Amino acid sequence: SRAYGAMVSCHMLSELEEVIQYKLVPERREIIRQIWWERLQGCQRIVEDWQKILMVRSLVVSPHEDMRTWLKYASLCGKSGRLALAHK
Amino acid sequence: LVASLFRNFLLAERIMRSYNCTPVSSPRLPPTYMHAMWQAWDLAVDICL
Amino acid sequence: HTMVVQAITFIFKSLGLKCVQFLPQVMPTFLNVIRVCDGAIREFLFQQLGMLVSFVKSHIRPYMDEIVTLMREFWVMNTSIQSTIILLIEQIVVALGGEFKLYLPQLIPHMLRVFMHDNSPGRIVSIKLLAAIQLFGANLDDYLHLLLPPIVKLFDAPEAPLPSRKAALETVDRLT
Amino acid sequence: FEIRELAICTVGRLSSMNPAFVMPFLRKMLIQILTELEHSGIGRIKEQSARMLGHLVSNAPRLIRPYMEPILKALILKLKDPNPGVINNVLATIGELAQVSGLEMRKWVDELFIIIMDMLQDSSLLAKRQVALWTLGQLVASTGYVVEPYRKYPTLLEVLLNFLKTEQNQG
Amino acid sequence: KSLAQSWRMKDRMKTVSVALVLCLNVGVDPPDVVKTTPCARLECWIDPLS
Amino acid sequence: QLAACEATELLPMIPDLPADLFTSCLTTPIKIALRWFCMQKCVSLVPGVT
């Protein structure tokens, strides 16, 4: 549980590797998005951690190209008592 | 008919070779069994079936 | 053990191809005798199985998997049984002919070990095995990439004796 | 052998240029490689053969996609045999196939995961924990097999946080 | 100057008729060849003994 | 003249093949060409092809 903070850095490092593939391999794109989606749900439901992680993915996927990530994100903000961010 | 027989004879030469048989033709043909083009047939069949 | 088989071999030679009738009786027992018999006789039985196979020729097919398993088990780096079995391979190759390529892959591991570590005086177990490989013919197609390097290492090795080097060179000559 | 490796890389690169010649010949070569793997009962030849199959998979992936199920069964079979360099090269190829195919080999991931997790632990069949971890990386990466490994193999987090507090290699 | 163009088929032969001499004697084997118990039996993609 | 064998040779007795092996090749190549493909060592590369 103390090691968890560090674990998210390696999550983001290895996600940044899958931005390199995504900008080079058009054939691999929808697999990568699905991997990305399945990966985030194993990760913890803290809003800071998600924000970190989504910013990485935003290097090559605008929020409109993947809604379900950003609604689940908005929903956490609602449940966590931070409705201002949820609204934005 | 002759052309069909000799086209198909080249296959006989290849197949029968693998069972200690050498077919014989009167206007003798040089041995085709090891032609590269047979590797193309193998691949072509493979992918098809 | 011995005298029984001296007859049974003589019976099959004297019969011709009409001996094929008797195979299913003879063979299963005969193979199980080789698995069980006490050492001194096994070189002798393998000689006579070889005779058996030369008379019967292509009717040996059904008992072949058992025969190979036997060879595979009793092949050792020991000089005595090797000359015997290498001779029994030459008799199986002429017998089956085209059907030998099903069984060759079981035997290859042993044949590649023969070249690698042959301590035989003047490498006569290697030389004998070269002479067999010459008979294999178009069976060797799918396995030539495995067999060929050892044979080539044989005739380029300066340490190895001359007979075994001509034997290697003459083989590549034939196989061509 | 070194020249052989170097040529198969070069010929694989030309399999896009003139596939009519190269693709038939590389298929013939693939068959030979898998024969040397299965039927030669020798450490060195099998060791070289895997190494070579590495280079084929990586350099001629079009040729190799249809033949992925055969190749992968041949390679998994070497990992389930009772020489170190064969297993190191066999693992390095499985890692390269993962990268070539992907999802296409999502069937085989749970098979290879058992095999490799058996090898990450235990220095009895002591392959390079470096390459075990490398190929394991590549399966999870390419095939897209994530988070499920922590359920199905619960010791993974106890195994992988052990290498960060045991071994003395950076790689 | 036009070269000696030798590409034409200076003959178009034709196979007008065919003789199918079949010496099978279906059932009885000849004295030469002793056949195996399973054996190769198919003849123009027909089992003759069926 | 086309002939199945050399003077010394005998035709194969192998139960998988036809007796008519040569005639079959000359006259129905694709049929034996595919059956032969399925008897070789190269079938390991295409599983589910009997």
UniProtKB/Swiss-Prot annotation, chain B:
**Superkingdom of this entry's organism?**
Eukaryota
Q: What does the UniProt record say this protein does?
A: Component of the mechanistic target of rapamycin complex 1 (mTORC1), an evolutionarily conserved central nutrient sensor that stimulates anabolic reactions and macromolecule biosynthesis to promote cellular biomass generation and growth. In response to nutrients, growth factors or amino acids, mTORC1 is recruited to the lysosome membrane and promotes protein, lipid and nucleotide synthesis by phosphorylating several substrates, such as ribosomal protein S6 kinase (RPS6KB1 and RPS6KB2) and EIF4EBP1 (4E-BP1).
Q: Where in the cell is it found?
A: Lysosome membrane; Cytoplasm; Cytoplasmic granule
Q: Which protein are we looking at?
A: Regulatory-associated protein of mTOR
Give a short account of its post-translational modification. Answer: O-GlcNAcylated by OGT upon glucose sufficiency, promoting interaction with small GTPases Rag (RagA/RRAGA, RagB/RRAGB, RagC/RRAGC and/or RagD/RRAGD) and subsequent recruitment of mTORC1 to lysosomal membranes, leading to activation of the mTORC1 complex.
- Quaternary state and interactors: Part of the mechanistic target of rapamycin complex 1 (mTORC1) which contains MTOR, MLST8 and RPTOR. mTORC1 associates with AKT1S1/PRAS40, which inhibits its activity. mTORC1 associates with DEPTOR, which regulates its activity. mTORC1 binds to and is inhibited by FKBP12-rapamycin. Forms a complex with MTOR under both leucine-rich and -poor conditions. Interacts with (via TOS motifs) EIF4EBP1 and RPS6KB1; interaction is independent of its association with MTOR. (Microbial infection) Interacts with vaccinia virus protein F17; this interaction dysregulates mTOR.
Concerning its family, UniProt says: Belongs to the WD repeat RAPTOR family.
Which organism does this sequence originate in? Answer: Homo sapiens (Human)
Tissue expression, as annotated, is: Highly expressed in skeletal muscle, and in a lesser extent in brain, lung, small intestine, kidney and placenta.
Curated annotation (Swiss-Prot), chain C:
Q: What is known of its domains?
A: The kinase domain (PI3K/PI4K) is intrinsically active but has a highly restricted catalytic center.
Q: Where are the HEAT repeats?
A: 22-60, 62-101, 102-138, 139-176
Instruction: Kindly state the tissue distribution recorded for this protein.
Output: Expressed in numerous tissues, with highest levels in testis.
What name does the UniProt record give this protein?
Serine/threonine-protein kinase mTOR
Subunit and interaction comment: Part of the mechanistic target of rapamycin complex 1 (mTORC1) which contains MTOR, MLST8 and RPTOR. The mTORC1 complex is a 1 Md obligate dimer of two stoichiometric heterotetramers with overall dimensions of 290 A x 210 A x 135 A. It has a rhomboid shape and a central cavity, the dimeric interfaces are formed by interlocking interactions between the two MTOR and the two RPTOR subunits.
Lineage of source species: Eukaryota, Metazoa, Chordata, Craniata, Vertebrata
* Family that this chain belongs to: Belongs to the PI3/PI4-kinase family.
Task: Describe the processing and modification events after translation.
Answer: Autophosphorylates when part of mTORC1 or mTORC2. Phosphorylation in the kinase domain modulates the interactions of MTOR with RPTOR and AKT1S1/PRAS40 and leads to increased intrinsic mTORC1 kinase activity.
Name where it's found.
Lysosome membrane; Endoplasmic reticulum membrane; Golgi apparatus membrane; Cell membrane
Q: Give the domain of life.
A: Eukaryota
Organism the protein comes from: Homo sapiens
| Gene name of the encoded protein | MTOR
Q: What does this protein do?
A: Serine/threonine protein kinase which is a central regulator of cellular metabolism, growth and survival in response to hormones, growth factors, nutrients, energy and stress signals. MTOR directly or indirectly regulates the phosphorylation of at least 800 proteins. Functions as part of 2 structurally and functionally distinct signaling complexes mTORC1 and mTORC2 (mTOR complex 1 and 2).
| Disease (UniProt) | Smith-Kingsmore syndrome: An autosomal dominant syndrome characterized by intellectual disability, macrocephaly, seizures, umbilical hernia, and facial dysmorphic features.
Curated annotation (Swiss-Prot), chain E:
Q: Where in the cell is it found?
A: Lysosome membrane; Cytoplasm; Cytoplasmic granule
Provide the positions where the record notes the PTM Phosphoserine: S2
* Tissue specificity as recorded in UniProt: Highly expressed in skeletal muscle, and in a lesser extent in brain, lung, small intestine, kidney and placenta.
Q: Could you state what the record's PTM comment says about this protein?
A: O-GlcNAcylated by OGT upon glucose sufficiency, promoting interaction with small GTPases Rag (RagA/RRAGA, RagB/RRAGB, RagC/RRAGC and/or RagD/RRAGD) and subsequent recruitment of mTORC1 to lysosomal membranes, leading to activation of the mTORC1 complex. Acetylation is decreased in response to fasting.
Subunit note: Part of the mechanistic target of rapamycin complex 1 (mTORC1) which contains MTOR, MLST8 and RPTOR. mTORC1 associates with AKT1S1/PRAS40, which inhibits its activity. mTORC1 associates with DEPTOR, which regulates its activity. mTORC1 binds to and is inhibited by FKBP12-rapamycin. Forms a complex with MTOR under both leucine-rich and -poor conditions. Interacts with (via TOS motifs) EIF4EBP1 and RPS6KB1; interaction is independent of its association with MTOR.
Known function: Component of the mechanistic target of rapamycin complex 1 (mTORC1), an evolutionarily conserved central nutrient sensor that stimulates anabolic reactions and macromolecule biosynthesis to promote cellular biomass generation and growth. In response to nutrients, growth factors or amino acids, mTORC1 is recruited to the lysosome membrane and promotes protein, lipid and nucleotide synthesis by phosphorylating several substrates, such as ribosomal protein S6 kinase (RPS6KB1 and RPS6KB2) and EIF4EBP1 (4E-BP1).
Family designation:
Belongs to the WD repeat RAPTOR family.
Q: What is this protein called?
A: Regulatory-associated protein of mTOR
From which source organism is this entry? Homo sapiens (Human)
